[PDB]
Design a protein around this ligand. Structure first.
Ligand SMILES: O=[N+]([O-])c1ccc(O)c(OS(=O)(=O)O)c1
Length: 279
């Protein structure tokens, strides 16, 4: 009876599970971006990049549109992908880069997660200057550390990108619906202030997209993108089924990895009177 009761939830999981299963990548899957002769592309072998929406041939990153909300979801860039990663950021005039990987993950060198935004560096012909800005508490002890990345390259227009780094959102978990809302708000506001700057100077659908990544770019990243989607007034009536199905067909079947992460999107939906299932 209740649109958010056990039966609705079970039906939703059922549909999404079949989707994840059928979206699993086969070897040399035509639906997924393939690596360039030996060079490692995917941080995680089974977490691939939908070819049709791929942003760059050498990155595991996808253009994503949930309803009307446009973003870019990617994996934490590998050491070898940094220059291409920075080029994507600059070419997109990235209004905000949201990093949900924890300080502990990036610090552990066994994870091969380069500390590319908290310190300056040079990658290929690109030089990056990192500058610390404000710190915003999101609730429940979760903290957002802000930065600005100035990307310089000979002959290219210099681009500065605001960074929102949630440094203590544990891998494989879901922060509360309340924290998720505070985060979505901060990310959206950060992006809007930047977009406004570009617009005030005289400004493309493929550009000015918020860029979000965690470790694999399918768990924490998906929870945030879903929350950002629900904060967009243009998505009235977009169901939870639609949101998740769209993220999955546009990146991979793992988008919204944990049941606890789906549960946050469901709770947020319930709070808005947003439907869970289609039909
Ligand atoms: O689904 N996975 O295979 C996967 C692997 C490593 C992660 O750290 C992770 O969690 S994620 O970074 O929030 O996406 C998810």
């Amino acid at each position: 009876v209740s649109p958010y009761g056990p039966e609705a939830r079970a039906e939703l999981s059922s549909r999404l599970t079949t989707l994840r299963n059928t979206l699993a990548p086969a070897t040399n899957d035509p639906r997924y971006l393939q690596a360039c002769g030996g060079e490692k592309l995917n941080r995680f072998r089974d977490i691939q990049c939908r070819r049709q929406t791929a942003v760059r041939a050498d990155l595991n990153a996808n253009y994503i549109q949930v309803g009307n909300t446009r973003t870019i979801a990617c994996q934490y860039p590998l050491q070898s992908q940094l220059e291409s990663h920075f080029r994507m950021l600059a070419e997109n005039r990235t209004p905000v880069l949201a990093v949900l990987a924890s300080s502990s993950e990036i610090a552990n060198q066994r994870f091969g997660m380069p500390d590319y935004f908290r310190q300056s560096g040079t990658y290929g012909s690109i030089t990056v200057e990192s500058k610390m800005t404000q710190q915003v508490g999101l609730g429940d002890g979760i903290m957002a550390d802000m930065y600005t990345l100035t990307i310089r390259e000979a002959g290219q227009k210099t681009i500065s990108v605001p960074v929102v780094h949630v440094g203590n959102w544990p891998d494989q978990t879901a922060v509360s619906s309340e924290v998720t809302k505070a985060l979505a708000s901060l990310v959206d506001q950060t992006a809007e202030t930047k977009r406004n700057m570009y617009e005030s100077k005289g400004s493309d659908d493929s550009k000015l997209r918020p860029v979000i990544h965690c470790r694999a770019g399918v768990g924490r990243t998906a929870q945030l993108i879903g929350a950002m989607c629900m904060n967009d007034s243009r998505n009235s009536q977009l169901s939870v089924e639609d949101m998740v199905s769209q993220m999955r067909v546009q990146r991979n079947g793992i988008m919204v990895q944990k049941d606890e992460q789906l549960d946050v999107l469901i709770k947020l939906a319930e709070g808005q009177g947003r439907p869970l299932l289609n039909s």
